[PDB]
Amino acid sequence: DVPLMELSGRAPVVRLHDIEADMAAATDAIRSQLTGWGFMAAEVPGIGERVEAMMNEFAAACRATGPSLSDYAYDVVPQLAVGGTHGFFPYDPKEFIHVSGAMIGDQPPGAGDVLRAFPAFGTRAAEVFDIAFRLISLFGEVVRGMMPPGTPELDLSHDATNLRVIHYRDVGDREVLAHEHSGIQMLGLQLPPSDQGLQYVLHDGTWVEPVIAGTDVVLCNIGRMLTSASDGRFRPSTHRVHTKPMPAGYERLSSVLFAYPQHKARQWKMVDGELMSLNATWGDFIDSR
Binding site for Cl ion (CB under 5 A): 183
| Amino acid at position 242, single letter | H
User: Between residues 183 and 192, which has the closer beta carbon with respect to Cl ion?
Assistant: 183
- One-character DSSP codes across 58-121: HHHHHH-SSS-GGGGBGGGS---SSS---EEE----EEEEEEEHHHHTT-STTTTHHHHHSHHH
- The only residue of 128, 132, 178, 219 in contact with ligand AKG, by rule CB under 6 A: 178
Pick 136 or 256: Cβ nearer ligand AKG: 256
Report if residue 254 touches ligand AKG, rule: CB under 6 A.
Answer: yes
Rounded Cα distance between 139 and 22, Å, is 12
Q: How many residues bind ligand AKG (CB under 6 A)?
A: 9
Q: Which is nearer to Cl ion, 118 or 285 (CB)?
A: 285
Provide the minimum distance between the beta carbon of 24 and Cl ion in the complex, in angstroms, as a whole number: 27
Residue 185 is classified by DSSP as S
Q: Rule CB under 6 A: which of 19-48 touch ligand AKG?
A: none
Residue of this chain nearest to ligand AKG (CB atom)? 254
Beta strands 187-190 and 274-281, pairing class: unpaired
128's contact among Cl ion, ligand AKG, none, with CB below 5 to 8 A by partner kind, is none
241 near ligand AKG (CB under 6 A) = yes
Query: What contacts 4, CB < 8 A, 6 or more positions away?
Result: 208, 209, 210, 211
Q: Does 164 bind ligand AKG (CB under 6 A)?
A: yes
How many other CB atoms are found less than 10 A from the CB of residue 186?
29
Type of residue at 147: M
User: Where on the chain is the footprint of ligand AKG (CB under 6 A)?
Assistant: 164, 166, 178, 193, 198, 239, 241, 254, 256
> Which residues are annotated as part of the binding site?
164, 168, 181, 239, 252, 254
